């Protein structure tokens, strides 16, 4: 029956067009079953979810679907849905991306990575720790994909230098290779959750909060950092121990140290541009953290309340990158008339920034925000909350555990951003129905959607690591089961112990009722 | 006194930083003179105008200044100013840019250009006409910069083929060269005004109308086209006659025909992707035109009023480019099990679109819209209208003439988009003060800001043409004086004769009072 296999291959080869054409027909009964506006909004949301999961269209292109569907269906006029795509959360994201582009332009990230690798050591467990701490720190500010793609060649070079009764020794070599190659994407995913700009789903949560709960303002850069950074550190430590036990065995060292010092020296001396970019990045982080950390007064109290935000601070800081000189200025240049008068190069030109900023992710976040606005305005949120009646008796902690497990095992097959975009309105409505703080369910879902460790399709970093060829699918699956379990447990601990104090989750807020 | 010249050169070399640092100090008295909110808004507007004119910052970076300045100054909170950057006008612009990227990806624009050049002829006056008609048609959908940059090499090749008592013949050769090289940017600038998506200032007018006059909806793709296309044709004819008289003398022909047929044949046969892109472009134009042309009922009357717009149609049409196959589909492929199962290439991937869309111009338009919103909300518009009291006795036609002349002679030194962004609120307030329709002053300013012909700095197409080296500054100045005069006269004629019927300019609208 080779004809069946041939037909299956033909169907799989044209899977994108088939899914694209047949998803609206399959979702058509949703419109008929539900009330008109809510049914049409749910149809749009489900269509976009299926398109994102199956990759029938580019993620940015699928994110543009509200623009078409909401006005034709009467859910939302164009002049309303279109500006949801540049809410201030997207400007915070854009400022973070511009700062990351400036950092990568001058190889500051590589210098920091190599310095940390020098500091931690060369011993095998110490080396997996070094790699994990480097990737998690660089994923806090750069994207997970960029951090993984930059750190993988360094790991490959170090492993080649290290490895440049035979069955035993070869087994240990291969296990060390697999451990090094699997510790990078996991640490990138873990570290992306520590900051709002670290990964897109955090900004999805921030932007969709404005639509579902416009009066909520307790989630900002400082509060999210003080909540997630200890959780990120605990999860990174647990993952490092798990990987070192599983794979790491918990003159080669000299060779690895030599290759690390080669790659650090190849960067040359620290340029003035690198120092300026680092100082601007430190100012960026400090001013984002200290604007309104909610436990001590911030510098936003010196201005009009309700006017400033993290986006304004980010844009103001990244504006300096476009005019600050990349060469060391000197007052003698004015006095010396014989010096050349070539115009100085700024720290970042707009050409490089534009060619390095992922505008697709910006449009994806905008599509998520517009879908949240359409769900709120069409009344689909009220209908969803009405449908969540049988779950109103679930204990809140058990509810957190179940939603975290469901989102973690659903993000293993789809993009984290799309997963959180689809699942966040459900979490908000469930929290409203459960007489509990909306953040108490929304934050764990946002954090857990980034807990994608089992499959190459789960996150782009996983695919980049799998492209190396030293990792099997079974290896990532068996590591990711326990990674997901530890992440779920630690997320529940964080949500029940110190998120309560940070976000005032103990009482139902006035803006949620 | 060579020290003075040396110091002047030092100052000019560091002009960007000097302007950037000293403009706020020079504009500081504006805050003190005016009332607080209006003074701060005017300070922001003047700072952005100076930065745009002097190029102290990249245009997109300067467009981000409202994000910083309005919240710190209390003019507008971040959650309000940031979404002004993705009003639906920017999505119409983005759809136009994506369609232009799809057109340029498959060399459809080059095929159309070469076909038109074949059709018009090879005779010198006929050849300047051909060039002008090609560049003006391609500037209607592509950007002026892109059209000029694509059409200049073709003109260079044709001139080289043509030229590949000696003083007389050399004079005629040089004049023909100058005429061909000057007819391209002028025609690109003229043709950019025919459509809303042809050039950014039209979209600036459309977006700022939403802020100044939210209830105005008579300006759309169809109405703007039926207003500007006859005006564009008349101005193109006048410019062609002027250039042919000034420079064109109003076996070389065989050689030029041979090189044109070489460059047409080098494109190969018409691909299926080219045909699909052309059909999608025709659908794009027709559906934009027929949505609500205001003289015959459109297809928007079949849906909810006030929900659809040109942006929705544009996004819906350009969405097809991202999944429609670039190769001819066949039903035999399913039946033939031995055919390869390689996935088909879409007409446009998001990678190419992202690397070809000018996101800087999108951010510039957004900055213009945000500045318009800040001017309206801060009360600066009311103050400006109060300051325009002595001009209330000027006849409306004379007012149109004066504003067109002022804007035309001001855009000769700065970007058209920045010029229209700065001048449009003044035009709206002057129209309000003058008891006349706001469009009667706003449209001529928007059209005339694109009438930049005298200097290389006026428009990027002028700079690209000047980079060839065959054009002198005096040549462009002497051509552009009469080009500007004819443009002003034709714009006044259009505003006083047939714009009145198209836009109902004869009476003060209810949404303006
Ligand atoms: C790998 C390929 C792609 C795979 C798919 C990826 C995307 C899909 C993700 C999972 C599926 C989505 C959720 C389940 C299907 C959609 C929900 C549904 O069936 O809604 C309609 C249904 C009608 O119920 P009704 O008859 O109204 O109940 C009696 C009272 N009227 O309503 C109900 O049954 C009531 C309960 C509704 C619960 C919430 C439904 C919406 C959840 C998502 C919101 C966003
Ligand atoms: C906001 C205030 C202003 C900014 C912060 C204060 C000023 C910091 C100094 C200016 C910048 C110096 C350049 C930093 C480059 C990136 C870090 C790096 O890789 O530095 C390595 C270098 C030491 O090694 P090196 O000398 O390069 O090589 C030979 C070693 N035997 O390192 C050095 O030489 C100096 C290392 C400095 C380490 C700084 C640690 C963090 C300081 C607080 C950050 C707060 C925000 C965090 C987010
Ligand atoms: C090449 C390098 C760059 C060159 C510069 C490029 C950008 C600048 C473009 C031209 C200059 C801008 C317009 C003129 C300067 C700004 C206007 C001004 O001076 O405003 C303050 C002034 C105060 O008038 P006041 O004392 O209030 O009058 C008595 C009643 N109170 O107000 C008045 O005098 C009253 C009349 C105001 C008329 C409109 C002013 C605003 C026009 C632009 C709005 C946008
Ligand atoms: C919305 C309805 C669907 C779309 C419009 C109707 C279908 C049009 C046909 C499908 C597309 C065909 C390919 C067009 C490519 C771009 C034009 C071009 O350069 O065509 C050249 C070609 C003739 O020359 P060729 O055969 O290539 O070379 C040897 C000549 N001896 O030309 C040809 O072979 C055909 C030329 C067709 C000319 C069409 C003119 C405009 C039609 C109305 C457009 C309305 C919207 C305008 C905006
Ligand atoms: C697109 C894929 C992956 C998901 C499944 C989509 C389709 C098959 C699903 C989604 C929602 C479903 C509908 C949900 C509710 C009802 C109401 C009742 O009359 C039972 C059938 C009916 C009408 C379902 C029919 C099947 C349905 C339309
Ligand atoms: C500018 C940064 C990067 C480096 C300089 C030092 C930092 C730590 C300084 C600069 C400005 C300072 C703020 C200025 C004003 C206030 C308001 C006051 O009621 C509480 C302290 C607070 C909020 C300060 C905190 C510390 C602060 C943020
Ligand atoms: C702050 C106010 C008062 C004065 C500003 C002076 C600025 C414009 C001056 C001071 C020092 C100068 C720099 C000194 C040296 C060089 C190296 C050479 O390649 C020329 C450009 C460059 C990079 C100069 C650019 C202009 C510069 C930055
Ligand atoms: C990696 C593992 C071992 C660490 C996390 C352990 C988990 C299962 C533990 C640690 C902290 C615990 C929570 C601490 C406090 C409360 C509040 C109480 O009123 C109900 C139980 C609840 C909600 C606990 C649920 C279980 C919990 C989340
Ligand atoms: C930046 C360059 C190109 C344009 C000129 C900017 C400066 C020099 C201009 C712009 C607006 C001007 C002010 C406009 C109005 C007044 C009120 C009155 O008291 C006269 C002086 C004063 C206070 C002017 C001082 C000079 C001023 C601040
Ligand atoms: C789809 C396009 C590109 C090609 C097909 C032909 C075009 C010209 C057709 C397709 C749909 C048509 C529209 C369908 C419905 C209406 C409403 C009616 O009250 C007036 C005519 C009007 C507004 C039609 C005008 C012509 C139209 C736009
Ligand atoms: C409309 C519904 C019912 C059926 C859709 C069938 C689609 C998916 C089929 C029909 C024709 C097919 C194409 C036929 C031939 C080729 C050339 C070869 O390189 C394989 C891919 C490609 C480009 C196929 C892609 C898939 C395709 C477009
Ligand atoms: C290239 C040149 C020759 C063509 C344009 C000529 C200009 C100067 C002419 C042609 C049409 C004319 C307008 C036609 C109608 C009116 C309405 C009338 O109540 C006042 C004069 C006014 C407003 C005219 C002003 C001058 C005008 C704009
Ligand atoms: C090709 C991707 C978009 C498909 C949109 C289909 C919309 C169908 C709507 C059906 C329900 C409303 C009928 C009036
Ligand atoms: C009740 C008013 C709206 C009726 C039509 C709703 C469905 C419109 C679907 C349009 C699809 C357009 C795809 C490009
Ligand atoms: C030895 C290093 C000397 C130079 C240190 C300062 C580098 C540039 C810092 C720029 C900071 C800008 C803040 C707005
Ligand atoms: C570097 C570009 C931005 C400069 C902004 C300067 C703002 C100054 C405001 C002064 C008036 C208000 C004082 C309270
Ligand atoms: C009256 C309330 C506001 C007072 C301050 C206004 C000026 C603020 C200027 C901030 C400049 C920031 C540059 C990054
Ligand atoms: C000889 C040419 C045969 C093919 C003509 C059609 C090309 C593709 C047209 C696609 C139109 C899509 C409309 C949504
Ligand atoms: O945004 C990132 O850091 C990349 C990872 C991500 O969000 C995804 O998997 O979609
Ligand atoms: O948008 C264009 O077509 C380019 C020309 C323009 O707008 C400008 O000169 O700024
Ligand atoms: Na990251
Ligand atoms: Na154009």
């Amino acid at each position: 029956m080779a004809a069946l296999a041939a037909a299956a291959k033909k169907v799989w080869s044209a899977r994108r067009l088939l899914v694209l054409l047949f998803t609206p027909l399959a979702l058509l009964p949703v419109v008929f079953a539900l009330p008109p506006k809510e049914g049409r909004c749910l149809f749009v949301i489900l269509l976009m979810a299926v398109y994102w999961c199956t990759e029938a269209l580019p993620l940015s292109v699928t994110a543009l679907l509200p623009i078409v569907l909401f006005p034709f269906m009467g859910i939302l006029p164009s002049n309303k849905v279109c500006p949801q795509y540049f809410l201030d959360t997207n400007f915070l994201f854009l400022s973070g991306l511009i700062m990351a582009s400036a950092i990568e332009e001058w190889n500051l990230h590589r210098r920091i990575a190599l310095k940390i690798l020098m500091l931690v050591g060369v011993q095998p467990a110490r080396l997996i720790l070094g790699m994990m701490v480097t990737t998690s720190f660089l994923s806090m500010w750069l994207s997970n994909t960029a951090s993984t793609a930059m750190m993988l060649p360094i790991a490959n070079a170090i492993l080649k230098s290290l490895f440049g009764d035979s069955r035993k020794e070869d087994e240990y070599r291969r296990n060390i290779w697999k451990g090094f190659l699997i510790s990078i994407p996991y640490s990138a995913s873990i570290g992306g959750t520590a900051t709002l700009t670290g990964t897109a789903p955090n900004l999805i949560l921030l932007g969709q909060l404005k639509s579902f709960f416009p009066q909520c303002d307790v989630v900002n850069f400082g509060s999210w950092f003080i909540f997630a950074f200890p959780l990120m550190l605990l999860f990174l430590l647990a993952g490092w121990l798990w990987i070192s036990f599983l794979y790491g065995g918990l003159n080669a060292e000299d060779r690895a140290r030599a290759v690390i010092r080669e790659e650090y020296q190849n960067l040359g001396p620290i340029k003035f541009a690198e120092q300026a970019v680092f100082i601007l990045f430190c100012m960026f982080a400090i001013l984002l953290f200290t604007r309104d950390p909610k436990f001590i007064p911030g510098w936003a109290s010196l201005f009009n309340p309700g006017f400033l935000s993290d986006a304004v601070t980010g844009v103001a800081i990244v504006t300096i990158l476009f005019f600050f000189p990349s060469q060391r200025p000197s007052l003698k240049w004015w006095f010396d008339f014989k010096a050349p008068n070539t115009e100085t190069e700024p720290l970042l030109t707009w050409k490089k920034a534009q060619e390095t900023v992922p505008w697709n992710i910006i449009l994806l976040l905008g599509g998520g925000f517009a879908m949240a606005k359409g769900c709120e305005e069409s009344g689909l949120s009220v209908w969803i909350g009405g449908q969540l009646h049988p779950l109103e008796n679930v204990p809140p902690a058990l509810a957190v555990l179940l939603i975290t497990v469901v989102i973690a095992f659903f993000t293993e097959f789809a993009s984290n951003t799309a997963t959180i975009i689809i699942f966040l309105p459900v979490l908000a409505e469930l929290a409203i129905r459960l007489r509990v703080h909306p953040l108490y369910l929304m934050i764990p879902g946002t954090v857990g959607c980034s807990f994608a460790f089992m499959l190459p399709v789960s996150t782009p970093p996983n695919s980049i690591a799998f492209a190396s060829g030293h990792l099997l699918v079974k290896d990532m699956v068996r590591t990711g089961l326990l990674m997901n379990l530890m992440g779920v447990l630690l997320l529940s601990l964080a949500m029940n112990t110190w998120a309560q104090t940070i976000f005032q989750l103990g009482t139902f807020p006035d803006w949620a009722d």
Side-chain angles (χ1 to χ4, degrees), chain A residues 5-16:
Chain A
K9 297 296 289 183
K10 307 302 281 198
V11 164
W12 182 254
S13 75
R15 69 198 171 285
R16 282 195 167 104

Side-chain angles (χ1 to χ4, degrees), chain A residues 407-423:
Chain A
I407 287 164
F409 278 105
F410 189 110
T411 192
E412 295 297 337
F413 310 105
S415 162
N416 308 353
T417 315
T419 302
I420 190 52
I421 284 168
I422 297 313
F423 281 72

Side-chain angles (χ1 to χ4, degrees), chain A residues 201-216:
Chain A
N202 306 350
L203 302 148
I204 283 299
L205 163 68
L206 196 71
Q208 293 207 348
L209 270 168
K210 288 187 165 291
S211 167
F212 300 134
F213 306 102
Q215 312 316 47
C216 175

Side-chain angles (χ1 to χ4, degrees), chain A residues 108 270-281 328 347:
Chain A
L108 192 61
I270 314 188
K271 296 179 177 67
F272 172 83
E274 288 182 86
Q275 299 164 337
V277 168
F278 179 77
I279 284 164
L280 275 166
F281 161 75
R328 197 180 305 270
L347 290 177

Side-chain angles (χ1 to χ4, degrees), chain A residues 93-146:
Chain A
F93 183 43
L94 175 62
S95 75
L97 296 171
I98 289 165
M99 180 83 237
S101 175
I103 286 159
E104 293 166 54
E105 162 66 22
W106 298 101
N107 290 318
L108 192 61
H109 63 305
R110 275 189 178 86
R111 186 176 296 274
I112 293 163
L114 294 166
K115 198 55 177 177
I116 296 170
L117 287 177
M118 290 170 139
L119 300 184
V120 182
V122 68
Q123 292 83 348
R126 270 166 83 188
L127 212 28
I128 295 163
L129 188 50
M131 293 279 342
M132 299 192 73
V133 164
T134 307
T135 320
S136 86
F137 175 75
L138 289 171
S139 199
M140 274 170 73
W141 316 105
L142 321 179
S143 75
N144 301 353
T145 299

